[PDB]
Each structure stands twice: as structure tokens, then as C-alpha cells.
Design a protein around this motif. Structure first.
Motif, PDB file in Angstrom:
ATOM      1  N   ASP A  31       0.804  -1.220   0.000  1.00 20.59           N
ATOM      2  CA  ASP A  31       0.000   0.000   0.000  1.00 20.59           C
ATOM      3  C   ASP A  31       0.840   1.273   0.000  1.00 20.59           C
ATOM      4  N   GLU A  32       2.165   1.173  -0.076  1.00 24.68           N
ATOM      5  CA  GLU A  32       3.040   2.337  -0.122  1.00 24.68           C
ATOM      6  C   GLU A  32       3.885   2.377  -1.383  1.00 24.68           C
ATOM      7  N   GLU A  33       4.535   1.267  -1.733  1.00 23.59           N
ATOM      8  CA  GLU A  33       5.337   1.170  -2.946  1.00 23.59           C
ATOM      9  C   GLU A  33       4.896   0.052  -3.874  1.00 23.59           C
ATOM     10  N   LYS A  34       4.113  -0.907  -3.373  1.00 28.73           N
ATOM     11  CA  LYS A  34       3.646  -2.001  -4.217  1.00 28.73           C
ATOM     12  C   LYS A  34       2.720  -1.495  -5.313  1.00 28.73           C
ATOM     13  N   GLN A  35       1.920  -0.468  -5.015  1.00 25.58           N
ATOM     14  CA  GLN A  35       1.032   0.097  -6.026  1.00 25.58           C
ATOM     15  C   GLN A  35       1.829   0.720  -7.166  1.00 25.58           C
ATOM     16  N   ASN A  36       2.850   1.513  -6.829  1.00 22.57           N
ATOM     17  CA  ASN A  36       3.687   2.120  -7.859  1.00 22.57           C
ATOM     18  C   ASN A  36       4.458   1.060  -8.635  1.00 22.57           C
ATOM     19  N   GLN A  37       4.916   0.011  -7.947  1.00 24.54           N
ATOM     20  CA  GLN A  37       5.618  -1.071  -8.631  1.00 24.54           C
ATOM     21  C   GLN A  37       4.702  -1.776  -9.623  1.00 24.54           C
ATOM     22  N   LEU A  38       3.457  -2.043  -9.217  1.00 26.72           N
ATOM     23  CA  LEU A  38       2.504  -2.689 -10.113  1.00 26.72           C
ATOM     24  C   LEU A  38       2.161  -1.787 -11.291  1.00 26.72           C
ATOM     25  N   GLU A  39       2.034  -0.480 -11.046  1.00 31.55           N
ATOM     26  CA  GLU A  39       1.762   0.452 -12.137  1.00 31.55           C
ATOM     27  C   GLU A  39       2.909   0.472 -13.140  1.00 31.55           C
ATOM     28  N   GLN A  40       4.148   0.517 -12.644  1.00 31.64           N
ATOM     29  CA  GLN A  40       5.304   0.509 -13.537  1.00 31.64           C
ATOM     30  C   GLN A  40       5.395  -0.804 -14.307  1.00 31.64           C
ATOM     31  N   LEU A  41       5.084  -1.922 -13.647  1.00 31.83           N
ATOM     32  CA  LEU A  41       5.127  -3.216 -14.321  1.00 31.83           C
ATOM     33  C   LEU A  41       4.063  -3.308 -15.407  1.00 31.83           C
ATOM     34  N   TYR A  59       4.671  -3.757 -19.381  1.00 29.96           N
ATOM     35  CA  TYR A  59       4.002  -4.812 -20.134  1.00 29.96           C
ATOM     36  C   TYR A  59       3.240  -4.241 -21.325  1.00 29.96           C
ATOM     37  N   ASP A  60       2.559  -3.108 -21.131  1.00 32.66           N
ATOM     38  CA  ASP A  60       1.846  -2.475 -22.235  1.00 32.66           C
ATOM     39  C   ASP A  60       2.814  -1.991 -23.306  1.00 32.66           C
ATOM     40  N   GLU A  61       3.958  -1.440 -22.894  1.00 29.80           N
ATOM     41  CA  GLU A  61       4.964  -1.005 -23.859  1.00 29.80           C
ATOM     42  C   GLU A  61       5.504  -2.185 -24.658  1.00 29.80           C
TER      43      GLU A  61
END
Lengths: 62, 49
Positions: free
Chosen positions: B9-19, B23-25
Motif C-alpha cells: 500500500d506504499e510502494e507495491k502500487q507504484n511497482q505494479l503500475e510501472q510493471l 508490459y503495455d509497452e
């Protein structure tokens, strides 16, 4: 036309070509008679490009 | 990854967004490469008149 095909030709008239570049209808009418053009699509007479149009959807001409 | 529901809930959200962005790229690059390859395969060859 040269890219896509016969399916994608736009209509053209003598009057439209004369209006393009300081020209008259009569003059171009004579130039384009028995003239041939070779493109990778094929070999075609210049008279072949000119044709009539029909009314299309959205005010356009086909 | 469950869209990083309650991992950190602090960095896992940003990590999932970057991942997901990576993946989309990669998917976009793969689609573009496949489209270019298919266009180059059947582009056409010039022949005699």
C-alpha cells in the motif's frame, strides 16, 4: 489510385485540371488523347483517368 | 498480481503500475514489429511491364 488501386480513384474532369494550373479545357483535351503512362500498377491511357461521378453520402462524389 | 491490493500500500502500487506500463509497452512494440514484418513480407516485387 497509384497506391491503393482502382477501388480508391477520385473523379476528375477536364475543367478541374484546367483550373489547376493556368490552363484551358480545349488545350488539355488534345494533350491527353492517345497518351500512355507506365506505372508499377500498369500501363494506362491518360483518357482512362477521367470519368464521371455519382452523388455519395455526406455530399461527396464517387 | 491482484493489482497490488494489499501487498504494501506504499510502494507495491507504484511497482505494479510501472510493471503494467512496461508490459503495455512491450505489447505495443510486439504488435508494431509484427505489423511491420507482415507489411514487409507481402509488400510486393516489381516485375517487367
Amino acid at each position: 489510385f497509384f497506391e491503393q488501386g482502382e477501388e480508391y480513384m477520385k473523379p476528375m474532369v477536364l475543367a478541374d485540371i484546367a483550373q489547376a494550373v493556368e490552363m484551358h479545357e480545349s488545350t488539355i483535351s488534345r494533350v491527353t488523347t492517345q497518351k500512355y503512362l507506365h506505372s508499377p500498377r500498369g500501363i494506362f491511357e491518360l483518357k482512362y483517368f477521367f470519368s464521371s461521378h455519382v452523388n455519395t453520402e455526406g455530399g461527396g462524389e464517387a | 498480481r491482484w493489482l497490488e491490493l494489499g501487498l504494501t500500500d506504499e510502494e507495491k502500487q507504484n511497482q505494479l503500475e510501472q510493471l503494467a506500463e512496461q508490459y503495455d509497452e512491450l505489447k505495443h512494440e510486439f504488435e508494431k514489429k509484427l505489423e511491420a514484418k507482415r507489411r514487409k513480407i507481402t509488400q510486393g516485387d516489381d516485375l517487367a511491364p
